[PDB]
mmCIF file of all heavy atoms in Angstrom:
data_model
loop_
_atom_site.group_PDB
_atom_site.id
_atom_site.type_symbol
_atom_site.label_atom_id
_atom_site.label_comp_id
_atom_site.label_asym_id
_atom_site.label_seq_id
_atom_site.Cartn_x
_atom_site.Cartn_y
_atom_site.Cartn_z
ATOM 1 N N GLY V 1 30.151 10.627 -11.846
ATOM 2 C CA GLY V 1 29.897 9.941 -13.130
ATOM 3 C C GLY V 1 28.419 9.764 -13.466
ATOM 4 O O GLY V 1 28.037 9.589 -14.631
ATOM 5 N N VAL V 2 27.585 9.797 -12.435
ATOM 6 C CA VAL V 2 26.145 9.765 -12.594
ATOM 7 C C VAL V 2 25.657 11.206 -12.573
ATOM 8 O O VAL V 2 25.865 11.918 -11.593
ATOM 9 C CB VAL V 2 25.508 8.951 -11.463
ATOM 10 C CG1 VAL V 2 24.044 9.204 -11.372
ATOM 11 C CG2 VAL V 2 25.771 7.481 -11.694
ATOM 12 N N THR V 3 25.020 11.610 -13.675
ATOM 13 C CA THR V 3 24.659 12.988 -13.979
ATOM 14 C C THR V 3 23.158 13.180 -14.002
ATOM 15 O O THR V 3 22.396 12.206 -14.099
ATOM 16 C CB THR V 3 25.142 13.394 -15.405
ATOM 17 O OG1 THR V 3 24.427 12.646 -16.410
ATOM 18 C CG2 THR V 3 26.644 13.195 -15.567
ATOM 19 N N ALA V 4 22.746 14.452 -13.967
ATOM 20 C CA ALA V 4 21.354 14.860 -14.110
ATOM 21 C C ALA V 4 20.674 14.216 -15.321
ATOM 22 O O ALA V 4 19.583 13.674 -15.198
ATOM 23 C CB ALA V 4 21.246 16.379 -14.174
ATOM 24 N N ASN V 5 21.304 14.253 -16.488
ATOM 25 C CA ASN V 5 20.735 13.547 -17.628
ATOM 26 C C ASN V 5 20.528 12.029 -17.399
ATOM 27 O O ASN V 5 19.517 11.470 -17.872
ATOM 28 C CB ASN V 5 21.517 13.803 -18.916
ATOM 29 C CG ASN V 5 20.704 13.467 -20.156
ATOM 30 O OD1 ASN V 5 20.051 14.344 -20.744
ATOM 31 N ND2 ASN V 5 20.707 12.194 -20.544
ATOM 32 N N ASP V 6 21.450 11.378 -16.673
ATOM 33 C CA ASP V 6 21.313 9.939 -16.398
ATOM 34 C C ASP V 6 20.088 9.703 -15.551
ATOM 35 O O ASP V 6 19.378 8.733 -15.751
ATOM 36 C CB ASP V 6 22.536 9.331 -15.665
ATOM 37 C CG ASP V 6 23.851 9.519 -16.411
ATOM 38 O OD1 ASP V 6 23.918 9.217 -17.625
ATOM 39 O OD2 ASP V 6 24.833 9.950 -15.766
ATOM 40 N N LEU V 7 19.841 10.574 -14.581
ATOM 41 C CA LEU V 7 18.719 10.333 -13.669
ATOM 42 C C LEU V 7 17.422 10.512 -14.409
ATOM 43 O O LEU V 7 16.531 9.652 -14.361
ATOM 44 C CB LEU V 7 18.812 11.221 -12.432
ATOM 45 C CG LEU V 7 20.168 11.137 -11.670
ATOM 46 C CD1 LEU V 7 20.117 11.939 -10.374
ATOM 47 C CD2 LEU V 7 20.608 9.738 -11.345
ATOM 48 N N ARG V 8 17.353 11.601 -15.161
ATOM 49 C CA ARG V 8 16.192 11.912 -15.960
ATOM 50 C C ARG V 8 15.988 10.829 -17.014
ATOM 51 O O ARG V 8 14.860 10.516 -17.390
ATOM 52 C CB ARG V 8 16.358 13.283 -16.608
ATOM 53 C CG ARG V 8 16.505 14.469 -15.635
ATOM 54 C CD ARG V 8 15.184 14.884 -14.901
ATOM 55 N NE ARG V 8 13.941 14.510 -15.599
ATOM 56 C CZ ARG V 8 13.247 15.302 -16.415
ATOM 57 N NH1 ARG V 8 13.658 16.535 -16.672
ATOM 58 N NH2 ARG V 8 12.137 14.847 -16.986
ATOM 59 N N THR V 9 17.090 10.237 -17.462
ATOM 60 C CA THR V 9 17.037 9.195 -18.479
ATOM 61 C C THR V 9 16.523 7.907 -17.877
ATOM 62 O O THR V 9 15.650 7.243 -18.442
ATOM 63 C CB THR V 9 18.418 9.028 -19.119
ATOM 64 O OG1 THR V 9 18.603 10.091 -20.055
ATOM 65 C CG2 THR V 9 18.561 7.732 -19.828
ATOM 66 N N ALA V 10 17.058 7.574 -16.716
ATOM 67 C CA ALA V 10 16.677 6.363 -16.035
ATOM 68 C C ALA V 10 15.199 6.444 -15.650
ATOM 69 O O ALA V 10 14.408 5.551 -15.947
ATOM 70 C CB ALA V 10 17.561 6.164 -14.845
ATOM 71 N N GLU V 11 14.803 7.562 -15.057
ATOM 72 C CA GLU V 11 13.397 7.766 -14.701
ATOM 73 C C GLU V 11 12.444 7.550 -15.882
ATOM 74 O O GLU V 11 11.379 6.929 -15.764
ATOM 75 C CB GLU V 11 13.257 9.169 -14.135
ATOM 76 C CG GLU V 11 11.853 9.655 -13.944
ATOM 77 C CD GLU V 11 11.811 11.157 -13.918
ATOM 78 O OE1 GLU V 11 12.161 11.786 -14.959
ATOM 79 O OE2 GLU V 11 11.439 11.699 -12.851
ATOM 80 N N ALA V 12 12.827 8.066 -17.033
ATOM 81 C CA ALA V 12 12.040 7.850 -18.221
ATOM 82 C C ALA V 12 11.972 6.366 -18.596
ATOM 83 O O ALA V 12 10.899 5.861 -18.933
ATOM 84 C CB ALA V 12 12.603 8.659 -19.346
ATOM 85 N N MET V 13 13.092 5.646 -18.535
ATOM 86 C CA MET V 13 13.070 4.299 -19.065
ATOM 87 C C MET V 13 12.268 3.371 -18.161
ATOM 88 O O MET V 13 11.551 2.445 -18.622
ATOM 89 C CB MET V 13 14.471 3.786 -19.287
ATOM 90 C CG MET V 13 15.105 4.282 -20.568
ATOM 91 S SD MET V 13 16.979 3.711 -20.628
ATOM 92 C CE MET V 13 17.729 4.789 -19.212
ATOM 93 N N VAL V 14 12.379 3.626 -16.865
ATOM 94 C CA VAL V 14 11.476 2.991 -15.923
ATOM 95 C C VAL V 14 10.055 3.319 -16.334
ATOM 96 O O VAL V 14 9.327 2.445 -16.773
ATOM 97 C CB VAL V 14 11.692 3.476 -14.508
ATOM 98 C CG1 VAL V 14 10.811 2.669 -13.582
ATOM 99 C CG2 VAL V 14 13.151 3.340 -14.133
ATOM 100 N N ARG V 15 9.655 4.580 -16.227
ATOM 101 C CA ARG V 15 8.251 4.904 -16.513
ATOM 102 C C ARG V 15 7.772 4.291 -17.814
ATOM 103 O O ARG V 15 6.604 3.922 -17.936
ATOM 104 C CB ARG V 15 8.006 6.400 -16.544
ATOM 105 C CG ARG V 15 7.990 7.044 -15.177
ATOM 106 C CD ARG V 15 7.586 8.532 -15.242
ATOM 107 N NE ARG V 15 7.908 9.182 -13.971
ATOM 108 C CZ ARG V 15 7.176 9.087 -12.858
ATOM 109 N NH1 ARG V 15 6.042 8.377 -12.831
ATOM 110 N NH2 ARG V 15 7.592 9.703 -11.763
ATOM 111 N N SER V 16 8.656 4.176 -18.794
ATOM 112 C CA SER V 16 8.258 3.548 -20.035
ATOM 113 C C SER V 16 7.980 2.063 -19.780
ATOM 114 O O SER V 16 6.844 1.607 -19.941
ATOM 115 C CB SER V 16 9.306 3.780 -21.116
ATOM 116 O OG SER V 16 9.041 3.015 -22.272
ATOM 117 N N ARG V 17 8.994 1.337 -19.312
ATOM 118 C CA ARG V 17 8.859 -0.089 -19.019
ATOM 119 C C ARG V 17 7.784 -0.456 -18.010
ATOM 120 O O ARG V 17 7.136 -1.473 -18.162
ATOM 121 C CB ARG V 17 10.200 -0.683 -18.624
ATOM 122 C CG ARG V 17 11.159 -0.769 -19.799
ATOM 123 C CD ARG V 17 12.544 -1.017 -19.353
ATOM 124 N NE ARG V 17 12.698 -2.395 -18.932
ATOM 125 C CZ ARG V 17 13.147 -3.375 -19.715
ATOM 126 N NH1 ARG V 17 13.479 -3.125 -20.987
ATOM 127 N NH2 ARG V 17 13.251 -4.614 -19.226
ATOM 128 N N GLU V 18 7.579 0.361 -16.989
ATOM 129 C CA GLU V 18 6.431 0.157 -16.105
ATOM 130 C C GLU V 18 5.079 0.142 -16.861
ATOM 131 O O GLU V 18 4.317 -0.809 -16.714
ATOM 132 C CB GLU V 18 6.419 1.170 -14.958
ATOM 133 C CG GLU V 18 5.651 0.649 -13.743
ATOM 134 C CD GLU V 18 5.376 1.689 -12.639
ATOM 135 O OE1 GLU V 18 6.271 2.494 -12.249
ATOM 136 O OE2 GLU V 18 4.231 1.657 -12.137
ATOM 137 N N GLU V 19 4.797 1.154 -17.684
ATOM 138 C CA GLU V 19 3.492 1.197 -18.389
ATOM 139 C C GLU V 19 3.302 0.012 -19.313
ATOM 140 O O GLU V 19 2.268 -0.635 -19.284
ATOM 141 C CB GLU V 19 3.274 2.508 -19.174
ATOM 142 C CG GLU V 19 1.850 3.090 -19.085
ATOM 143 C CD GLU V 19 0.881 2.511 -20.107
ATOM 144 O OE1 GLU V 19 1.292 1.682 -20.944
ATOM 145 O OE2 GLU V 19 -0.307 2.895 -20.080
ATOM 146 N N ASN V 20 4.318 -0.282 -20.107
ATOM 147 C CA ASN V 20 4.227 -1.318 -21.113
ATOM 148 C C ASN V 20 4.475 -2.759 -20.642
ATOM 149 O O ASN V 20 4.098 -3.707 -21.333
ATOM 150 C CB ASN V 20 5.222 -1.010 -22.221
ATOM 151 C CG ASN V 20 4.854 -1.670 -23.523
ATOM 152 O OD1 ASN V 20 3.773 -1.412 -24.081
ATOM 153 N ND2 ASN V 20 5.743 -2.526 -24.023
ATOM 154 N N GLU V 21 5.143 -2.941 -19.508
ATOM 155 C CA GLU V 21 5.570 -4.298 -19.142
ATOM 156 C C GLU V 21 5.167 -4.725 -17.737
ATOM 157 O O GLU V 21 5.484 -5.835 -17.319
ATOM 158 C CB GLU V 21 7.090 -4.503 -19.309
ATOM 159 C CG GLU V 21 7.775 -3.663 -20.369
ATOM 160 C CD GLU V 21 9.146 -4.213 -20.744
ATOM 161 O OE1 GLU V 21 9.194 -5.337 -21.295
ATOM 162 O OE2 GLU V 21 10.178 -3.538 -20.501
ATOM 163 N N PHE V 22 4.499 -3.855 -16.992
ATOM 164 C CA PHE V 22 4.267 -4.209 -15.622
ATOM 165 C C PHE V 22 3.264 -5.317 -15.449
ATOM 166 O O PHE V 22 3.624 -6.349 -14.912
ATOM 167 C CB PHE V 22 3.893 -3.044 -14.737
ATOM 168 C CG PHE V 22 3.630 -3.463 -13.336
ATOM 169 C CD1 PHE V 22 4.666 -3.965 -12.555
ATOM 170 C CD2 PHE V 22 2.342 -3.423 -12.808
ATOM 171 C CE1 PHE V 22 4.438 -4.383 -11.257
ATOM 172 C CE2 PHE V 22 2.091 -3.841 -11.507
ATOM 173 C CZ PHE V 22 3.151 -4.321 -10.727
ATOM 174 N N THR V 23 2.011 -5.118 -15.874
ATOM 175 C CA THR V 23 0.987 -6.125 -15.611
ATOM 176 C C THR V 23 1.518 -7.484 -16.029
ATOM 177 O O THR V 23 1.429 -8.447 -15.258
ATOM 178 C CB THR V 23 -0.337 -5.848 -16.314
ATOM 179 O OG1 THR V 23 -0.608 -4.450 -16.288
ATOM 180 C CG2 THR V 23 -1.475 -6.570 -15.597
ATOM 181 N N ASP V 24 2.132 -7.537 -17.213
ATOM 182 C CA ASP V 24 2.736 -8.772 -17.733
ATOM 183 C C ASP V 24 3.732 -9.444 -16.766
ATOM 184 O O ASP V 24 3.881 -10.662 -16.770
ATOM 185 C CB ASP V 24 3.404 -8.518 -19.095
ATOM 186 C CG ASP V 24 2.433 -8.672 -20.312
ATOM 187 O OD1 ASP V 24 1.185 -8.946 -20.178
ATOM 188 O OD2 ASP V 24 2.961 -8.518 -21.441
ATOM 189 N N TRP V 25 4.390 -8.645 -15.935
ATOM 190 C CA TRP V 25 5.505 -9.097 -15.101
ATOM 191 C C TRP V 25 4.968 -9.529 -13.740
ATOM 192 O O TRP V 25 5.413 -10.518 -13.147
ATOM 193 C CB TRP V 25 6.527 -7.959 -14.968
ATOM 194 C CG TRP V 25 7.630 -8.104 -13.911
ATOM 195 C CD1 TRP V 25 8.952 -8.489 -14.121
ATOM 196 C CD2 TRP V 25 7.537 -7.798 -12.505
ATOM 197 N NE1 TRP V 25 9.646 -8.466 -12.936
ATOM 198 C CE2 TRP V 25 8.812 -8.043 -11.935
ATOM 199 C CE3 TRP V 25 6.499 -7.361 -11.672
ATOM 200 C CZ2 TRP V 25 9.067 -7.856 -10.584
ATOM 201 C CZ3 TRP V 25 6.762 -7.175 -10.316
ATOM 202 C CH2 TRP V 25 8.030 -7.418 -9.796
ATOM 203 N N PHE V 26 4.011 -8.763 -13.247
ATOM 204 C CA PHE V 26 3.344 -9.098 -12.012
ATOM 205 C C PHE V 26 2.699 -10.477 -12.178
ATOM 206 O O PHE V 26 2.835 -11.348 -11.310
ATOM 207 C CB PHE V 26 2.296 -8.037 -11.689
ATOM 208 C CG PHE V 26 1.755 -8.157 -10.328
ATOM 209 C CD1 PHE V 26 2.508 -7.763 -9.241
ATOM 210 C CD2 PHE V 26 0.515 -8.708 -10.118
ATOM 211 C CE1 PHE V 26 2.000 -7.890 -7.954
ATOM 212 C CE2 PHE V 26 0.009 -8.837 -8.845
ATOM 213 C CZ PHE V 26 0.748 -8.431 -7.765
ATOM 214 N N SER V 27 2.021 -10.661 -13.314
ATOM 215 C CA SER V 27 1.519 -11.959 -13.755
ATOM 216 C C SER V 27 2.498 -13.118 -13.543
ATOM 217 O O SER V 27 2.075 -14.253 -13.316
ATOM 218 C CB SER V 27 1.146 -11.877 -15.222
ATOM 219 O OG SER V 27 -0.092 -11.204 -15.351
ATOM 220 N N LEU V 28 3.795 -12.838 -13.611
ATOM 221 C CA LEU V 28 4.778 -13.907 -13.534
ATOM 222 C C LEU V 28 5.532 -13.929 -12.208
ATOM 223 O O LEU V 28 6.501 -14.654 -12.065
ATOM 224 C CB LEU V 28 5.795 -13.763 -14.670
ATOM 225 C CG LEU V 28 5.839 -14.723 -15.859
ATOM 226 C CD1 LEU V 28 4.517 -15.390 -16.145
ATOM 227 C CD2 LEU V 28 6.374 -13.953 -17.068
ATOM 228 N N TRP V 29 5.085 -13.138 -11.250
ATOM 229 C CA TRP V 29 5.923 -12.802 -10.133
ATOM 230 C C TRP V 29 5.718 -13.762 -8.955
ATOM 231 O O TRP V 29 4.590 -13.972 -8.488
ATOM 232 C CB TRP V 29 5.651 -11.359 -9.751
ATOM 233 C CG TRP V 29 6.570 -10.826 -8.741
ATOM 234 C CD1 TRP V 29 7.918 -10.991 -8.699
ATOM 235 C CD2 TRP V 29 6.231 -10.002 -7.622
ATOM 236 N NE1 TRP V 29 8.435 -10.342 -7.619
ATOM 237 C CE2 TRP V 29 7.430 -9.724 -6.936
ATOM 238 C CE3 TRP V 29 5.036 -9.478 -7.128
ATOM 239 C CZ2 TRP V 29 7.470 -8.944 -5.788
ATOM 240 C CZ3 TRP V 29 5.077 -8.705 -5.989
ATOM 241 C CH2 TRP V 29 6.278 -8.445 -5.328
ATOM 242 N N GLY V 30 6.825 -14.329 -8.473
ATOM 243 C CA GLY V 30 6.809 -15.363 -7.432
ATOM 244 C C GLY V 30 5.882 -15.093 -6.261
ATOM 245 O O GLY V 30 5.139 -15.978 -5.846
ATOM 246 N N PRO V 31 5.941 -13.879 -5.695
ATOM 247 C CA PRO V 31 4.977 -13.443 -4.658
ATOM 248 C C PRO V 31 3.502 -13.445 -5.066
ATOM 249 O O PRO V 31 2.654 -13.786 -4.229
ATOM 250 C CB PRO V 31 5.444 -12.030 -4.315
ATOM 251 C CG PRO V 31 6.971 -12.042 -4.690
ATOM 252 C CD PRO V 31 7.006 -12.876 -5.929
ATOM 253 N N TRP V 32 3.187 -13.071 -6.315
ATOM 254 C CA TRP V 32 1.793 -13.101 -6.802
ATOM 255 C C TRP V 32 1.370 -14.551 -6.865
ATOM 256 O O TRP V 32 0.315 -14.932 -6.388
ATOM 257 C CB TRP V 32 1.662 -12.440 -8.183
ATOM 258 C CG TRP V 32 0.265 -12.384 -8.774
ATOM 259 C CD1 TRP V 32 -0.083 -12.646 -10.070
ATOM 260 C CD2 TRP V 32 -0.971 -12.035 -8.101
ATOM 261 N NE1 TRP V 32 -1.456 -12.481 -10.248
ATOM 262 C CE2 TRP V 32 -2.012 -12.110 -9.058
ATOM 263 C CE3 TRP V 32 -1.292 -11.663 -6.790
ATOM 264 C CZ2 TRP V 32 -3.331 -11.832 -8.746
ATOM 265 C CZ3 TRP V 32 -2.616 -11.394 -6.481
ATOM 266 C CH2 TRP V 32 -3.620 -11.476 -7.457
ATOM 267 N N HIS V 33 2.254 -15.369 -7.406
ATOM 268 C CA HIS V 33 2.033 -16.789 -7.521
ATOM 269 C C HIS V 33 1.761 -17.469 -6.183
ATOM 270 O O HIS V 33 0.851 -18.269 -6.088
ATOM 271 C CB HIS V 33 3.214 -17.413 -8.262
ATOM 272 C CG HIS V 33 3.149 -17.217 -9.744
ATOM 273 N ND1 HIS V 33 3.923 -17.937 -10.626
ATOM 274 C CD2 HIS V 33 2.358 -16.417 -10.504
ATOM 275 C CE1 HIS V 33 3.633 -17.571 -11.864
ATOM 276 N NE2 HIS V 33 2.682 -16.655 -11.818
ATOM 277 N N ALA V 34 2.498 -17.156 -5.130
ATOM 278 C CA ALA V 34 2.146 -17.790 -3.866
ATOM 279 C C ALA V 34 0.715 -17.450 -3.532
ATOM 280 O O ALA V 34 -0.051 -18.329 -3.150
ATOM 281 C CB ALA V 34 3.056 -17.380 -2.746
ATOM 282 N N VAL V 35 0.345 -16.183 -3.701
ATOM 283 C CA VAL V 35 -1.004 -15.727 -3.320
ATOM 284 C C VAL V 35 -2.094 -16.477 -4.079
ATOM 285 O O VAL V 35 -3.141 -16.779 -3.512
ATOM 286 C CB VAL V 35 -1.199 -14.200 -3.509
ATOM 287 C CG1 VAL V 35 -2.672 -13.785 -3.289
ATOM 288 C CG2 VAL V 35 -0.317 -13.454 -2.558
ATOM 289 N N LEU V 36 -1.845 -16.764 -5.355
ATOM 290 C CA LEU V 36 -2.828 -17.447 -6.185
ATOM 291 C C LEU V 36 -2.994 -18.887 -5.740
ATOM 292 O O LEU V 36 -4.139 -19.365 -5.579
ATOM 293 C CB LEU V 36 -2.494 -17.357 -7.678
ATOM 294 C CG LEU V 36 -2.675 -15.960 -8.302
ATOM 295 C CD1 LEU V 36 -1.911 -15.842 -9.618
ATOM 296 C CD2 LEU V 36 -4.176 -15.562 -8.450
ATOM 297 N N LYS V 37 -1.864 -19.555 -5.506
ATOM 298 C CA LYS V 37 -1.863 -20.878 -4.913
ATOM 299 C C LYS V 37 -2.615 -20.828 -3.595
ATOM 300 O O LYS V 37 -3.393 -21.726 -3.293
ATOM 301 C CB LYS V 37 -0.440 -21.396 -4.723
ATOM 302 C CG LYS V 37 0.223 -21.778 -6.048
ATOM 303 C CD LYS V 37 1.508 -22.609 -5.874
ATOM 304 C CE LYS V 37 2.324 -22.611 -7.171
ATOM 305 N NZ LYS V 37 3.729 -22.942 -6.880
ATOM 306 N N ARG V 38 -2.442 -19.741 -2.850
ATOM 307 C CA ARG V 38 -3.080 -19.584 -1.536
ATOM 308 C C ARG V 38 -4.604 -19.345 -1.602
ATOM 309 O O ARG V 38 -5.395 -20.225 -1.246
ATOM 310 C CB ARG V 38 -2.380 -18.461 -0.750
ATOM 311 C CG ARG V 38 -2.281 -18.693 0.745
ATOM 312 C CD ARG V 38 -0.978 -19.442 1.145
ATOM 313 N NE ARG V 38 -1.169 -20.213 2.381
ATOM 314 C CZ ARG V 38 -2.005 -19.877 3.365
ATOM 315 N NH1 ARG V 38 -2.695 -18.749 3.298
ATOM 316 N NH2 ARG V 38 -2.134 -20.654 4.439
ATOM 317 N N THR V 39 -5.004 -18.162 -2.063
ATOM 318 C CA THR V 39 -6.415 -17.756 -2.064
ATOM 319 C C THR V 39 -7.230 -18.354 -3.218
ATOM 320 O O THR V 39 -8.299 -18.903 -2.997
ATOM 321 C CB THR V 39 -6.568 -16.216 -2.102
ATOM 322 O OG1 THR V 39 -5.737 -15.685 -3.140
ATOM 323 C CG2 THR V 39 -6.154 -15.603 -0.798
ATOM 324 N N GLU V 40 -6.714 -18.249 -4.446
ATOM 325 C CA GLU V 40 -7.471 -18.673 -5.629
ATOM 326 C C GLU V 40 -7.001 -20.033 -6.166
ATOM 327 O O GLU V 40 -6.679 -20.177 -7.351
ATOM 328 C CB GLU V 40 -7.409 -17.591 -6.707
ATOM 329 C CG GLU V 40 -8.767 -17.231 -7.251
ATOM 330 C CD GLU V 40 -9.565 -16.404 -6.275
ATOM 331 O OE1 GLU V 40 -9.278 -15.192 -6.146
ATOM 332 O OE2 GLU V 40 -10.470 -16.971 -5.618
ATOM 333 N N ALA V 41 -6.991 -21.025 -5.274
ATOM 334 C CA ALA V 41 -6.513 -22.372 -5.564
ATOM 335 C C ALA V 41 -7.096 -22.882 -6.857
ATOM 336 O O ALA V 41 -6.368 -23.369 -7.728
ATOM 337 C CB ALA V 41 -6.889 -23.318 -4.427
ATOM 338 N N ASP V 42 -8.422 -22.751 -6.962
ATOM 339 C CA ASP V 42 -9.176 -23.343 -8.037
ATOM 340 C C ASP V 42 -8.932 -22.721 -9.390
ATOM 341 O O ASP V 42 -8.450 -23.412 -10.286
ATOM 342 C CB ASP V 42 -10.645 -23.407 -7.695
ATOM 343 C CG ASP V 42 -11.005 -24.714 -7.060
ATOM 344 O OD1 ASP V 42 -10.081 -25.550 -6.935
ATOM 345 O OD2 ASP V 42 -12.183 -24.904 -6.695
ATOM 346 N N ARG V 43 -9.214 -21.428 -9.544
ATOM 347 C CA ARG V 43 -8.826 -20.722 -10.776
ATOM 348 C C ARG V 43 -7.373 -21.049 -11.208
ATOM 349 O O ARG V 43 -6.996 -20.901 -12.377
ATOM 350 C CB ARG V 43 -8.993 -19.207 -10.619
ATOM 351 C CG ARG V 43 -10.433 -18.696 -10.595
ATOM 352 C CD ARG V 43 -10.495 -17.280 -11.141
ATOM 353 N NE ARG V 43 -11.548 -16.490 -10.517
ATOM 354 C CZ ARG V 43 -12.629 -16.026 -11.141
ATOM 355 N NH1 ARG V 43 -12.823 -16.248 -12.435
ATOM 356 N NH2 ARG V 43 -13.518 -15.319 -10.466
ATOM 357 N N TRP V 44 -6.561 -21.511 -10.267
ATOM 358 C CA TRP V 44 -5.170 -21.796 -10.571
ATOM 359 C C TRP V 44 -5.063 -23.053 -11.407
ATOM 360 O O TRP V 44 -4.462 -23.045 -12.474
ATOM 361 C CB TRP V 44 -4.353 -21.904 -9.284
ATOM 362 C CG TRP V 44 -2.946 -22.332 -9.474
ATOM 363 C CD1 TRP V 44 -2.422 -23.567 -9.215
ATOM 364 C CD2 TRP V 44 -1.858 -21.521 -9.938
ATOM 365 N NE1 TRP V 44 -1.079 -23.574 -9.493
ATOM 366 C CE2 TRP V 44 -0.709 -22.331 -9.943
ATOM 367 C CE3 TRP V 44 -1.744 -20.185 -10.355
ATOM 368 C CZ2 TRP V 44 0.536 -21.853 -10.362
ATOM 369 C CZ3 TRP V 44 -0.499 -19.711 -10.765
ATOM 370 C CH2 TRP V 44 0.612 -20.544 -10.772
ATOM 371 N N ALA V 45 -5.658 -24.131 -10.922
ATOM 372 C CA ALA V 45 -5.641 -25.387 -11.641
ATOM 373 C C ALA V 45 -6.202 -25.165 -13.039
ATOM 374 O O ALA V 45 -5.639 -25.649 -14.018
ATOM 375 C CB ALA V 45 -6.448 -26.419 -10.899
ATOM 376 N N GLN V 46 -7.284 -24.398 -13.132
ATOM 377 C CA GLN V 46 -7.877 -24.079 -14.428
ATOM 378 C C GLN V 46 -6.908 -23.353 -15.357
ATOM 379 O O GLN V 46 -6.970 -23.512 -16.571
ATOM 380 C CB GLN V 46 -9.154 -23.261 -14.276
ATOM 381 C CG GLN V 46 -9.941 -23.153 -15.578
ATOM 382 C CD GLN V 46 -11.239 -22.350 -15.453
ATOM 383 O OE1 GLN V 46 -11.347 -21.423 -14.643
ATOM 384 N NE2 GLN V 46 -12.224 -22.699 -16.279
ATOM 385 N N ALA V 47 -6.028 -22.540 -14.787
ATOM 386 C CA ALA V 47 -4.998 -21.896 -15.587
ATOM 387 C C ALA V 47 -3.936 -22.920 -15.987
ATOM 388 O O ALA V 47 -3.458 -22.913 -17.126
ATOM 389 C CB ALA V 47 -4.389 -20.740 -14.844
ATOM 390 N N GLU V 48 -3.584 -23.812 -15.059
ATOM 391 C CA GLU V 48 -2.644 -24.893 -15.353
ATOM 392 C C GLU V 48 -3.124 -25.637 -16.594
ATOM 393 O O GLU V 48 -2.434 -25.679 -17.619
ATOM 394 C CB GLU V 48 -2.547 -25.850 -14.166
ATOM 395 C CG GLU V 48 -1.139 -26.314 -13.865
ATOM 396 C CD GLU V 48 -0.298 -25.223 -13.201
ATOM 397 O OE1 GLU V 48 -0.889 -24.439 -12.412
ATOM 398 O OE2 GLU V 48 0.940 -25.151 -13.461
#
């Protein structure tokens, strides 16, 4: 039921969403957030 066109289609939609939506999403990402709380404590409060 999963075909060559589906794979090529899925690959495209990822590559599209990655270019247009990635930085925005990493910005919101729980793991990135721990790191900011960790290393960049100060810039964090300023963002708060």
Side-chain angles (χ1 to χ4, degrees):
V2 164
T3 67
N5 199 94
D6 303 310
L7 307 186
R8 299 287 336 265
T9 282
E11 169 203 63
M13 280 174 291
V14 186
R15 285 186 194 281
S16 171
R17 290 166 75 95
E18 205 190 316
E19 221 274 357
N20 203 60
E21 331 197 65
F22 179 66
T23 321
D24 273 2
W25 168 101
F26 191 75
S27 283
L28 251 26
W29 188 44
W32 181 223
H33 281 195
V35 172
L36 289 161
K37 288 194 196 159
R38 215 90 208 330
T39 49
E40 230 74 76
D42 268 358
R43 288 209 212 246
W44 174 256
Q46 192 179 31
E48 221 74 35

